[PDB]
Each structure stands twice: as structure tokens, then as C-alpha cells.
Design a protein around this ligand. Structure first.
Ligand SMILES: [Cl-]
Ligand SMILES: [Cl-]
Ligand SMILES: [Cl-]
Ligand SMILES: [Fe+2]
Ligand SMILES: [Fe+2]
Lengths: 313, 321
């Protein structure tokens, strides 16, 4: 498939050699640069793949990352090395983590420009990853139930993933479907919309809005629109959250990273509350207060200058 | 990519050898002594351009849904000779259709209103171009529908429900026959459109046709408004020898205001799309790749009808029984 990019032996061996440089450098992750994880041929190719998910269908699966003979610690450093050719990593939670373990789901986006998942160990049976184009869903609705689209273009309340108190979350407004200068952007997450109601000041969800978001979920789950993906050790999935909704079917171990990327799209008016800034190619996304602190923060600035990602002041 | 050509991808130029091939083909046709309705590709041989023409007509089933062939040698020909040349080219395009109540299968166009023609593929051969203006305009119907899905989705339902159209095949234009058809439809993943405001408004002259509701009038007006926007329109300035080919299921066409002379033909084609339920009234048959379109009663009669059957068998166009 066009979204599948396989690594050949030389490229896999190139990653092993890159990790050796990183391990032998005596530098910790947050002090490293791409020169400490050299990918002479795979580097430019990875940048190109990340650039390509700015277009439909908005995701890519890289296959063949050599993780089988590595320790868990070594895989994380390898993953960190690959991330230096993807984007600027972001803190993802209130625990100052920039790499989250997924071990032992309705369609949704992650609150970041690009999310990646590296599979170290695959699920025995279930755990099939599901991805769908948000624009394809919007287009089905435009044929089948256009009367509901207006509800998804008006801003709806979302609980902020960065809320310190999840029982009384901070809330921002965002449309589910938007577009700016011809580039579409989506935000969909039923749980976050329902949780927004725990803030008594947030607007109340009308039944029309509830009907519309439920319609989005129903259509996204249809066979004709879904692309299933059964992760194998060494798979690196990359998703553009402006274009893709992702989900999962019912000793797995995946590693998640969040990235700001230099090719991200500028956003429509009013999207500052949800994303921090409208301008594309900037350091943005969930939990602004988490970012740009300590050694990790100094890595973000160096990495942003390396890839050409602007840091809003 | 790595190359960026001057010509648009929908522009197909003829080289000298291809032009000479048409000149030679016309010589064969004129020297055979056969009239148009008795001829076959054997009487207008295009060894290299024939297959290329078939491929271009097949390719307009996909986006962008139109093509402009440039360089047909018409400059030194009489009006009569250009018509014979055009007829020869049509034997590699599709099965020609009767277009009006005077049994014409080649109509003269002489001296906005986006619309389709009531046929699968319409072609225009430019013998003479207008000195100033007269720019041909084409727009993607699905692109118009998609703007509406963003800007005014509440109006789309009115365009998916059948609307009344005056039938071009009506004997009495002041008392037209009327059929119902949606403005936008899709079947098995392939979209189809019908749009022509004048025809929709003229349907009201038939007292039996349904009266146009406010939502329908607002919706069709919105389609016209969006189609005329600069960002969606593709202009084309015809030159002598240009052959424009348009797939009416995907493209709406129009013209800007002003010795113009174009020749129009209508074709059933073997790669045409199957249509949604209820489209029989407007098209005759839903099945794709069949002889269909406006005025079924006009077709398959006399010598022209026998040419249609021979031509349909050559190209693989089915004739429903
Ligand atoms: Cl999230
Ligand atoms: Cl017509
Ligand atoms: Cl009319
Ligand atoms: Fe997620
Ligand atoms: Fe026309």
C-alpha cells in the first residue's frame, strides 16, 4: 500500500549503526543532536515521509525498525534517535513525560500535530489499530446527512487533556471540522466533549450536537472507510491528527511520542484556545505550560532550530 | 516532482504526423464516395491517432473530466470538408446521437449559465474562433458540491431530491415535457450531476410539473453562484482546430459574453457510468456503457440508426432492447 514504507537491510543496519554512535557518545538523550544518531540515507527519507502525511490519507506505517535484539532501554534511545528526524518532541502529560509506554476505544485524535507509535512487542490477538480519514467521514455525512454538518462546524466544548483536575477540567471550544486556505483540520473525541460538561461554566451540549458527534462515530466505524493495521515488532506508525481519527479493537508494548513538525498547517480563526497558536510549523499543541522546561526544554529549542520549527514567544 | 510542463495535463497537442494522418484519412473518405452514415473507420483510418483518441475519451471518465485536443487541420478546408473530417474523428470517440427534432447529429454553434448537455460526452470542434471574448469555462460539479458542504450544507438536501427539468427533446418548447432528476447524485462511488437553471425554471411552464419550492430555488441559485467563482473555473480560449471533449457527469460548462463557428456532437461511450435509481426518466437507462441520453425516440431510425448500431458494435456500446 502507498502508506506502507518498508526498510531494507541496509536501512536497518543504518539504524543499528546510528544507535551505536548515540550510545558511544556519552551524551544523554536531551543533550543529543541528529549528528549523534546519523541516518545518511534514512534521515532524508524519514523527513519526506513525515512531510507526506500532511496530505490525504494523513498516515504512514514504517516497517522494519530493528528492535528484536535490543533491551527496553536501548529501544527507547533508538526511538529517541528516530524522533530527531521526525519533529520536535512534546511533553504529553502532567508527569513531564515525552515518551509514553502503552501496555495492557472510540475514534479520536491526539492533541498534537503528529503522533507516532513504535511497536516493540505486539498483541497476541486483538489490539488491531484502526485509522480513518476525517475528511472522508465528513464527505459521507455531506451525502447522507448534510443537515448535521452545521452542528460540527460550530465550536463545541472539549475537556483539555492538560487539565490539572480532570473532575473539574479546563474547557476550550473547537469545531469538529474546519478548514483554512484549503487545508482541513479535525478534532474529534466524544469522551472529551462529554467530560467538558463537568465544568458548570462550559456550554451545555444540545441534542443536535450529541446527534452529530454520534453520527461521526457511527460512520467512522464502517468497513469501507477504516484501514486496519496489525502492528508487528519494528512498526513505526505516524499519524497527522488534523486528518486522521484513530482507534483500536478490543504482552503488547508500544511507545508513543508527540511532535510539532515544520510542515504543519495554519489553522482557522478561533483555534488558538485549542492549539495555542494558529500559525503552522510552530511549537504548539496540548499543555503549553508543560513545554520548554529544564534539559528537555533546551533540547526542544535546539531541535526546533534544526528542523525550522518556530517557537512562539 | 522534478518537471513542470508548460501545457496543462488536460491539453493534448497533435504533432505534424498526426495532423497529416487526419488529412490522409479525409482523402480516403472523400475518395470512397460514401456518405457519412455508410462509412466506417476503414473509410477514415487513423492508425496512430485512433487509439490515442480512444484513450483520451476513456480518460475523461476520471478527474478533471474534460480534454482539449489542439491542432486539428481545419485551415484549408471548406465548411463541408470540415464536417466530413469531424464525422471521421467521431468514429473514434463514440456513438453519435441525434440532438434535436430536426434529426441533426452535428449542430452548428455560431454568434453565464453553467450547465451540462443531456448526453454522456459532448464535443466541440472549432472551425473559426471568436475574435474577442467567447472564453469557454469549465468547472468541476463535485467541487461545487463540496464548497456547499462547507458553506451551506442545509441546502444540499434540496439538490439530492429530484427537481423538475424541461426536456430538451420536447416538441413544443412553450409546453415542455418535464422529468425529475437530482442535481447531485452518486452510485457505486461514481458521481453524476445535472444542472441547468433555465431548464428547471422552464419546467414550470408545464402546469403538471411540481411547483418549485423556496429551498429549491435558493439551492440552484447557490450552485450557479459558486460555479462562477474564479477559484473553481478553468478558462479555455478556443483556437481553430481545437476539439474540446467534456464528460457531462463531472463538468459544468459555460461561456463569457462577446465569426465564431463551432461544431457540436453528442456521444454515447462504452466507458460511461451506471447511474442511481430513478435516473431512467432523464437518461433512458441507468446501465453504463449503453446508448442513452436525450430523445430516445429520435435514435435508431433509418440510415443514421444503422450507423449507430454498427458503431455501437465496434466500440462495445450496448443497445438496450
Ligand atoms: Cl490527547
Ligand atoms: Cl441539453
Ligand atoms: Cl433552455
Ligand atoms: Fe490516541
Ligand atoms: Fe452546452
Amino acid at each position: 500500500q502507498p502508506w506502507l514504507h518498508r526498510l531494507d537491510p541496509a536501512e536497518a543496519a543504518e539504524i543499528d549503526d546510528a544507535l551505536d554512535v548515540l550510545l558511544k557518545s556519552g551524551k544523554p538523550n536531551f543533550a543529543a543532536s541528529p549528528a549523534d544518531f546519523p541516518l545518511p540515507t534514512l534521515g532524508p527519507r524519514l523527513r519526506g515521509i513525515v512531510d507526506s502525511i500532511e496530505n490525504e490519507p494523513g498516515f504512514a506505517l514504517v516497517r522494519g525498525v530493528p528492535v528484536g535484539d535490543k533491551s527496553e532501554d536501548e529501544v527507547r534511545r533508538l526511538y529517541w534517535g528516530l524522533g530527531m528526524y521526525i519533529g520536535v518532541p512534546m511533553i504529553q502529560n502532567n508527569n513531564d513525560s515525552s515518551m509514553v509506554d502503552i501496555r495492557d476505544i472510540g475514534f479520536h485524535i491526539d492533541s498534537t500535530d503528529v503522533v507516532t507509535l513504535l511497536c516493540r512487542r505486539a498483541a497476541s490477538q486483538g489490539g488491531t489499530s484502526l485509522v480513518v480519514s476525517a475528511e472522508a467521514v465528513r464527505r459521507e455525512m455531506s451525502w447522507e446527512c448534510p443537515e448535521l454538518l452545521s452542528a460540527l462546524y460550530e465550536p463545541l466544548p472539549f475537556a483539555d487533556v492538560a487539565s490539572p483536575d480532570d473532575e473539574r477540567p479546563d474547557v476550550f471550544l473547537s469545531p469538529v471540522f474546519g478548514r483554512h486556505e484549503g487545508l482541513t483540520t479535525t478534532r474529534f473525541y466524544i469522551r472529551r466533549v462529554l467530560r467538558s460538561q463537568d465544568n458548570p461554566d462550559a456550554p451545555r451540549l444540545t441534542e443536535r450536537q450529541l446527534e452529530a458527534i454520534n453520527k461521526v462515530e457511527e460512520i467512522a466505524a464502517r468497513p469501507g472507510l477504516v484501514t486496519p493495521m496489525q502492528f508487528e515488532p519494528g512498526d513505526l506508525q505516524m499519524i497527522n491528527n488534523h486528518l486522521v481519527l484513530h482507534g483500536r479493537t478490543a504482552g503488547r508494548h508500544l511507545l508513543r511520542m508527540w511532535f510539532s513538525v515544520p510542515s504543519s498547517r495554519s489553522l482557522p480563526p478561533g483555534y488558538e484556545a485549542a492549539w495555542g497558536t494558529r500559525e503552522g510549523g510552530t511549537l504548539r499543541g496540548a499543555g503549553p505550560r508543560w513545554q520548554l522546561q529544564g534539559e528537555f526544554g533546551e533540547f526542544q529549542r535546539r531541535q526546533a532550530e534544526e528542523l525550522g520549527v518556530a517557537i512562539p514567544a
